[PDB]
Amino acid sequence: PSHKTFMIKKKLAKKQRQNRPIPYWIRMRTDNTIRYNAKRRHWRRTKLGF
Amino acid sequence: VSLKLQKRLAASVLKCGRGKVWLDPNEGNEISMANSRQNIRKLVKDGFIIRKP
Amino acid sequence: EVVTREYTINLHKRLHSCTFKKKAPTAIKEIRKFAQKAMGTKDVRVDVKLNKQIWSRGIRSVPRRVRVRIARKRNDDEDAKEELYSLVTVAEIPAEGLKGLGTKIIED
Amino acid sequence: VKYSKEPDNPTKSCKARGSSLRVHFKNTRETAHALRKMPLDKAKRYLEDVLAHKQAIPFTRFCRGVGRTAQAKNRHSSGQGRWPVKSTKFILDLLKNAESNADVKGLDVDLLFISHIQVNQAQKQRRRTYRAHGRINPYMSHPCHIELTLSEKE
Amino acid sequence: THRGLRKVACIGAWHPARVSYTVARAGQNGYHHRTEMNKKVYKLGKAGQESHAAITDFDRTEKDITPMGGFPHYGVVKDDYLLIKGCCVGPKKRVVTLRQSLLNQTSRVALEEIKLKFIDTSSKFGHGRFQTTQEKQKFYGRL
Amino acid sequence: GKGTGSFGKRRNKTHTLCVRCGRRSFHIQKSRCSACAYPAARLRKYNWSVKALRRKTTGTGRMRYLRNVPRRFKTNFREGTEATPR
RNA sequence: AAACGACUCUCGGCAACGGAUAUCUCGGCUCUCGCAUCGAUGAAGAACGUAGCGAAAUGCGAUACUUGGUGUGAAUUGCAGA
RNA sequence: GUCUCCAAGGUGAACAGCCUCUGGUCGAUGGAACAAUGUAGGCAAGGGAAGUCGGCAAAAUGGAUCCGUAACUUCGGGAAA
RNA sequence: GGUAGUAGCAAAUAUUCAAAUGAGAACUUUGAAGGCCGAAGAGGGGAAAGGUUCCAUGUGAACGGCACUUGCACAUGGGUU
Ligand SMILES: [K+]
Ligand SMILES: [K+]
Ligand SMILES: [K+]
Ligand SMILES: [K+]
Ligand SMILES: [K+]
Ligand SMILES: [K+]
Ligand SMILES: [Mg+2]
Ligand SMILES: [Mg+2]
Ligand SMILES: [Mg+2]
Ligand SMILES: [Mg+2]
Ligand SMILES: [Mg+2]
Ligand SMILES: [Mg+2]
Ligand SMILES: [Mg+2]
Ligand SMILES: [Zn+2]
Question: Name one GO biological process term (chain E) (predicted).
Answer without folding.
Answer: translation
